[PDB]
RNA sequence: AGGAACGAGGUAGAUGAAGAGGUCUGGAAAGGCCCGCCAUAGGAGGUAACAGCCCUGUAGUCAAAACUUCGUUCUCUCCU
RNA sequence: GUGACCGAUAGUGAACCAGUACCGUGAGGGAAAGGUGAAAAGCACCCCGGAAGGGGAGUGAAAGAGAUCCUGAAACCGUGUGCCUACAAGUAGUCAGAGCCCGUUAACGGGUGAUGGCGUGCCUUUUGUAGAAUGAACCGGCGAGUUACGAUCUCGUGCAAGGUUAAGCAGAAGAUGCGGAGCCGCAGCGAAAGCGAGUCUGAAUAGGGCGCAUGAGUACGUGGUCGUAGACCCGAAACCAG
RNA sequence: AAUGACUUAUCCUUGGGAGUCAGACUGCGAGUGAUAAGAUCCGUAGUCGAAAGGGAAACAGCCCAGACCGCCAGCUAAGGU
RNA sequence: UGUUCUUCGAACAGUGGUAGGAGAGCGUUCUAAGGGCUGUGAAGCCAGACCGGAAGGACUGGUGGAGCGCUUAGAAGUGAG
């Protein structure tokens, strides 16, 4: 038999142009540029997943080194003392809101001045 | 259609008993001043085709 | 059988093999057949018999002659294939035909030693070997040619 | 196999026992469905066909040169890609038919009709004595007998009375002894057979 | 190497069973529920929506003034 | 009379005034184009307008059903609205992210997003392409591993040292029942005569090659592959006949 | 290549199905060339081809290291503060 | 996904990938089996913030006005950038 295939195609398209939705111009539009811009947003979902991890990281130990540095020390100096007084695993952004929630930094802080010297 | 058999290939090579087909060596029909003896009493004998050939040829004898 | 669940047999019936429908299946674009050859093209391809212009092994090698043109296949009783009979009495090839051992009466019938008996036959057949007719006739048995 | 008799009245008392060779053994589910699927073939009549591109009714030039012109080469008026059609392979005039081998035949008819022993569908009436040609009288018959669903009426010596009545019923095909088959026995679930069409089957198959 | 009648067909047709069943939604029931019939007829197409019992119809019983297609008999013709 | 045949780019080129319109001096080539509603009951009448075309009022189950007239997608063209845009160098996205506006198949909610970080489309062909190498203006439809007959292998089923019948005759052009005519295997070797659990070469009761010894095929079905077929689609320049 | 150990889990035979006969760079060792070439032809190891990620500013082949997916977890390599 | 033990299952190891090989699946049309939705509204179309590892699938609201789906099988004019 003859099978004519018209419904399926269509709703493939139409699935694509939904995920395709925001865009600027015919990205949202026409299929056939909407499918790689999802393509190429999903390898930027996937790498950006992975970066966010790091900059996080990288964004806390700024706002560490800059607390550590109002009260005299580096970021390096602040590490070596977390590990030297006792093996406290405490993470860095619960480091970054303990200067929200000041002066417990501080506190943290003068464990680390008592040891390193 | 039927398969057709190489019919030169029917002249040549023979079917044995699995086979592992028979045929003859070459160098045999000309020119036996320039070969040595021990060399004519082993072309003389039969062979065996070997098993690279044999999965190239094996197609062309189907219906033996 | 029920007639609205139809059961196959486990391994007997296999899905055909889709070739160019997609690159996620294999055998997508270049459907099996690799980029840009001969073999890759429609159509072929080289003959069967073909090494791509060397001398081909055939045609390199002699003919062996000959074919008989009257040719006879006394072909093929063996001495196990009498014990079917029990006890067996006029071995005949006319017999054989229809007991079922022969399917093909080829212009005669030879019994051939292979094996042995332990029954007394009366054998009637066109040829014999050597070890057949001294095995028929340590058994007692009468070997006769027709 | 204990198989109670029926005399369409009663009914009955006694019964007949079926042979174990035909009616008693263990059925084999992929011999039947080999047979269920080489029946449905050959029913089919594979009269489809399309027009091949040599097939379509279009000229052989072509329609523009090869070089030149900024188009395609197009080299018929009507290759698969234009709208003139359009296929290369197509459905193609065939017979579906092939052959079991007969053992297969003879091990699904009787592993079929085992298995309908074994549920119980089987229904045994000796003779069919139908006096008029009337499908009201069949009807009241297969009533009698707690007949509600399709039905086979398995017949000897194919009598015209029998023949005649029961096709007009959409559920009800009769048969006759030797004509039985794979499909008709799947496919109505309850067979009426006559013992003269038994004691046929039995030396037939 | 010429014709006359009997039997079956075609070219064309007739007859041919059974429900307005009641209620509900509907623009219209051929649909749902509860109910009875015909059937050698439950092949199909229409009917205001999916008919078996609405129409044309179908299965069977049949018809042929006039053309032919076969089969049988007779006339006729031929024969050591 | 029937389709595990098509349904308006399909199926005859042609479901429609089709070998028609049109093109060519001629031979010849050769389209596109179906659908209101059950019933025209095809909008009486009023108003704007020269008319076309509208808004009421009617017929209708539906008038967004009103003459290419069932349903009516996307490219494309517009009108409103919520949030951002006139210091900003961007394969236009993604992650983070305040503000503003709404409430969902209530779910770590949806839309827009100032700003920061990262990030040179897709395919083909290539040692190597973001490539300034090729292809695509966009959207929709159509568009390329099929089928017949043989061969080989795997798996499954039936029977097993015996398996299978073809044509044909009966029989819903169906299954099947009859048909063993033939085919394959049941041990081979040898060029052949021939011999045979052996045979050939050879003077050889020696050696060696092949094969039992040490042992499973057959008939169908699915799948992979190969031959004969345009054989995986499209594409020449050319040749021949009338 | 041998027999005594310790690690590993690979290795032959048969049968079915292929693709690949344009390779590139780097380190070492040769030829041709002018011990010129991002040159050509070889042998050897790696990488790319067919490998994303981090570093060499960008830069297939260099250095470090092989991406089933998720986490707003930690420790490190090359390279840096 | 593979191996071992096998005491519902657990432990250990693995899971970049072109050409290519193998396996398991999702969709489209038609047919056979039963069973079931439909004018108290089918297919189709449009929107949604739903579900599944994927191809995909459901449920609501609107348009639409008459067919469609489920099942276990089987065939193919079997999926388009």
């Given at each position: 038999p003859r099978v004519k295939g018209g419904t399926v195609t269509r709703k493939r398209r139409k699935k694509v142009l939904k995920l395709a939705k925001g865009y600027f111009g015919s990205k949202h539009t026409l299929y056939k540029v909407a499918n790689q811009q999802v393509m190429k947003s999903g390898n930027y979902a996937f790498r950006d997943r992975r970066q966010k991890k790091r900059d996080f990281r990288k964004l806390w130990i700024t706002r560490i080194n800059a607390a550590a540095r109002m009260n005299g020390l580096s970021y390096s100096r602040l590490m070596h003392g977390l590990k030297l007084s006792?093996?406290?695993?405490?993470r860095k952004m619960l480091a970054d809101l303990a200067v929200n929630d000041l002066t417990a930094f501080n506190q943290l802080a003068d464990a680390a001045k008592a040891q390193l010297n | 259609p039927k398969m057709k058999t190489h019919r030169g290939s029917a002249k040549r090579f023979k079917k044995t008993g699995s086979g592992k087909l028979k045929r003859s060596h070459a160098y045999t029909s000309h020119l036996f001043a320039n070969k040595s003896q021990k060399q004519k009493r082993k072309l003389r004998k039969s062979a065996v085709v070997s098993a690279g050939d044999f999965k190239r040829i094996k197609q062309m004898l189907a219906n033996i | 059988m029920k007639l609205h669940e139809l059961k196959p047999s486990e391994g007997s019936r296999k899905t055909r093999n889709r070739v160019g429908r997609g690159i996620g299946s294999g055998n997508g674009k270049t459907a099996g057949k690799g980029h840009k050859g001969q073999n890759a093209?429609?159509?072929?391809?080289?003959?069967?018999?073909?090494?791509?212009?060397?001398?081909?092994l055939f045609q390199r090698l002699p003919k062996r002659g000959f074919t008989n043109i009257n040719r006879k296949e006394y072909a093929v009783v063996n001495?196990?294939?009498?014990?079917?009979?029990?006890?067996?009495?006029?071995?005949?090839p006319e017999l054989l035909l229809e007991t079922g051992v022969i399917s093909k009466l080829n212009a005669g019938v030879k019994i051939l030693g292979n094996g042995k008996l332990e029954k007394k036959l009366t054998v009637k057949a066109n040829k014999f070997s050597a070890s057949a007719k001294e095995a028929v006739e340590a058994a007692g048995g009468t070997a006769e040619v027709i | 196999p204990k198989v109670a008799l029926y005399?369409?009245?009663?009914?009955?008392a006694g019964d007949i026992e079926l042979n174990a060779s035909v009616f008693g053994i263990e059925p084999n589910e992929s011999v039947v469905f080999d047979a269920i699927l080489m029946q449905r073939a050959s029913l089919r009549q594979g009269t489809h066909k399309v027009k091949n591109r040599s097939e379509v009714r279009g000229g052989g030039r072509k329609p523009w040169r090869q070089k030149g012109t900024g188009r395609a080469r197009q080299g018929s008026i009507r290759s698969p890609q234009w709208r003139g059609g359009g296929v290369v392979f197509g459905p193609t005039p065939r017979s579906y038919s092939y052959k079991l081998p007969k053992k297969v035949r003879r091990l699904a008819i009787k592993s079929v009709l085992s298995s309908k022993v074994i549920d119980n569908n089987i229904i045994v009436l000796e003779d069919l004595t139908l006096d008029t040609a009337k499908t009201k009288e069949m009807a009241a018959i297969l009533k009698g007998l707690s007949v509600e669903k399709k039905a086979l009426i398995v017949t000897a010596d194919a009598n015209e009375a029998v023949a005649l009545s029961?096709?007009?019923?959409?559920?009800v095909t009769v048969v006759e002894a030797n004509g039985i088959n794979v499909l008709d026995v799947v496919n109505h679930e309850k067979l009426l057979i006559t013992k003269a069409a038994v004691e046929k089957v039995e030396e037939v198959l």
């Open positions: 006792g093996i406290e695993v405490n | - | 093209r429609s159509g072929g391809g080289v003959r069967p018999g073909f090494e791509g212009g060397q001398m081909p001495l196990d294939k009498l014990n079917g009979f029990a006890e067996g009495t006029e071995v005949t | 005399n369409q009245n009663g009914s009955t029961a096709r007009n019923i959409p559920g």
